[PDB]
Amino acid sequence: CPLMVKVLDAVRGSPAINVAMHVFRKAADDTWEPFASGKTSESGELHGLTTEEEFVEGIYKVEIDTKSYWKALGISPFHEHAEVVFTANDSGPRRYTIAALLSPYSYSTMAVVT
Amino acid sequence: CPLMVKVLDAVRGSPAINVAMHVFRKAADDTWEPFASGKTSESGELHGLTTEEEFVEGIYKVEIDTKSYWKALGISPFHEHAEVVFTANDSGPRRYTIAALLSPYSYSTMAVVT
Amino acid sequence: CPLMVKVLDAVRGSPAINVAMHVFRKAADDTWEPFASGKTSESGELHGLTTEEEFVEGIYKVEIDTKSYWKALGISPFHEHAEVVFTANDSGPRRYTIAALLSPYSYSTMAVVT
Amino acid sequence: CPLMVKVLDAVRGSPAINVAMHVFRKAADDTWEPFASGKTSESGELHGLTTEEEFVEGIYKVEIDTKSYWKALGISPFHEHAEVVFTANDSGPRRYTIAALLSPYSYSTMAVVT
Numbered sequence: 001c002p003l004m005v006k007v008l009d010a011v012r013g014s015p016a017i018n019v020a021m022h023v024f025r026k027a028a029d030d031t032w033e034p035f036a037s038g039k040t041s042e043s044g045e046l047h048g049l050t051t052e053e054e055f056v057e058g059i060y061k062v063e064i065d066t067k068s069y070w071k072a073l074g075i076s077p078f079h080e081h082a083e084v085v086f087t088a089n090d091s092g093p094r095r096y097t098i099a100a101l102l103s104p105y106s107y108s109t110m111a112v113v114t
Numbered sequence: 115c116p117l118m119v120k121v122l123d124a125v126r127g128s129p130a131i132n133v134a135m136h137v138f139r140k141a142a143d144d145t146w147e148p149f150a151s152g153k154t155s156e157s158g159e160l161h162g163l164t165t166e167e168e169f170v171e172g173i174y175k176v177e178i179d180t181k182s183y184w185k186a187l188g189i190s191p192f193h194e195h196a197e198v199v200f201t202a203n204d205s206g207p208r209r210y211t212i213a214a215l216l217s218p219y220s221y222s223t224m225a226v227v228t
Numbered sequence: 229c230p231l232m233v234k235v236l237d238a239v240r241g242s243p244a245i246n247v248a249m250h251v252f253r254k255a256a257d258d259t260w261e262p263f264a265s266g267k268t269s270e271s272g273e274l275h276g277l278t279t280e281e282e283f284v285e286g287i288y289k290v291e292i293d294t295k296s297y298w299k300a301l302g303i304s305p306f307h308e309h310a311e312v313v314f315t316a317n318d319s320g321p322r323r324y325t326i327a328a329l330l331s332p333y334s335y336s337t338m339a340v341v342t
Numbered sequence: 343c344p345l346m347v348k349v350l351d352a353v354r355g356s357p358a359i360n361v362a363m364h365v366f367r368k369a370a371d372d373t374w375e376p377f378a379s380g381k382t383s384e385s386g387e388l389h390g391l392t393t394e395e396e397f398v399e400g401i402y403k404v405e406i407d408t409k410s411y412w413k414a415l416g417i418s419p420f421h422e423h424a425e426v427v428f429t430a431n432d433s434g435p436r437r438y439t440i441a442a443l444l445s446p447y448s449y450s451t452m453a454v455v456t
Contacts, residue, residue: 008441011239013306013333013455059194078225078241080173080199086192099350101452103331105241106224108450110443111192113219113355125353127341127420127447192355215338217445219355222336224329227241287422306428306453308401313422333455338448339420 002055003036003088005046005062006099011075015044016102019069023049026059035060052093061085066102077104084109116169119160119176120213125189129158130216133183137163140173149174166208175199180216192219200225230283233274233290234327239303243272244330247297251277254287263288280322289313294330306333314339344397345378345430347388347404348441353417357386358444361411365391368401377402394435403427408444419446426451 003023007016019040024032036049062084070077084098097112117137121130133154138146150163176198184191198212211226231251235244247268252260264277290312298305312326325340345365349358361382366374378391404426412419426440439454 008452008454010331010334010452013453015454078200078227080201083197083199085194085197087194101334101450103238103334105227106222106238106329106331108220108222108336108443110220110350110352111355112350112357113192122338122340124338124445124448127339129340129342215336215448217352217448220352220443220445222329222450224236224238225241226236226243228243306455308427308429311425311427313425314420315422334450334452336448336450341420341447 001047002052002093002095003049003060004095004097005040005049005064006097007040007044007046007064008099008101009044010101010103015042016040016069016100017042017044019044020065021046021049022063022065024061024063026061032061055089055093057089058087059085060088062098064100066100066107069102070104075104079107082107082109084111086111115161116166116209117161117163117174118209118211119154119163119178120211121154121158121160121178122213122215123158124215124217125187129156130154130183130214131156131158132186133158134179135160136177136179138175138177140175146175169202171202171204173199173201176212178214180221183216184218189218193221196221196223198223198225229275230280230323231275231277231288232323232325233268233277233292234325235268235272235274235292236327236329237272238329238331239301243270244268244297244328245270245272246300247272248293249274250291250293252289252291254289260289283316285316285318287313287315290326292328294335297330298332303332307335310335310337312337312339343389344394344435344437345391345402346437346439347382347391347406348439349382349386349388349406350441350443351386352443352445357384358382358411358442359384359386361386362407363388363391364405364407366403366405368403374403397431397435399431400429401427402430404440406442408442408449411444412446417446421449424449424451426453428453 023036025035027033064082101108137150139149141147178196207227215222251264253263255261292310321341329336365378367377369375406424443450
């Protein structure tokens, strides 16, 4: 699994469940093309977005819909979404774990590359 | 000054100086329109981006060029840039401070609204 | 002002006001000695803790009472308090800003040394 | 496994390997008693610190020796260590994951409680 996302809720001390995820890849024309999407599981994780074969060199954007997550909890948050944009596999295939820690007015994102 | 930005370097324990920034407004069209830009000062800050008359309700994107900043220091960073996307509402508070804390493989961003 | 503290609330997007703080110095003995204390201001800040003459090289601990702060808001927090332990060296820079970003189940702390 | 620690390096985008960990429990006399210790694995994790039976109600402190970690990489960091102090199991047994994200002048800590 070359691309995995983990999302945590810092208000509740728990995984962030059912958070929607959309991944885009920058295309030849320099526009964002849809690449994969999904929802986090009860452990706050999303896997199975892609395969090594399809996950070629390129610039990827992971958009996490944090706004809907907080609104469903009764909270009106600051950000519309959290975005993570990065170049992948430009020196050969790698495995990427993207983690996000959410609070209503702040978020942190971390990448582990192996 | 309704919108201020502050950027800190968690590797050297200092303000992040000379970091380029671009601010966009979501165009009725849903296209991003250039709105303001600048480079952070010796104190890691950028203000005077807009005025209260021009800063109307809407969706705004703040794009911080973190990749050029790490490259200047000789460090290979993970992210292409850091983006902060938010709604400005006249309803709530009037002053927005966007802060960003940078590491090569992680960033944290926080909003103070007062 | 060689030592300043700043505390922010990531849940409400505001300074953390009236938060108690205690500063300790490691005693030749390795016992913590009271050194200074105060409550954060309406801007989430605490300064005037010490003077340059009294702030000599040593190991210092800053203890922030985050549990009382969340309890005041009606939120059950995870941590008993947040602690920041560091060496002050005259060698390097002279001014220390300790910042803390609080959530009920997470905190982040950063030092700017200038 | 009721108590697990995960440590990540935000400079290198990797688990933090071989980081020393000490856990203490506050004793009747209100002093810190040694409870368990260990080093993180190649995945940046530490498990097997304790059992449900031994992990009774109480106030625990997890001390992570971040200073030795950064010094071994050639970096002189700000903090002496990272400390996480919390009450555990006061409403029945729970499972605790303590995560820490490290940079030389900043760290973040998060708890997931299940």
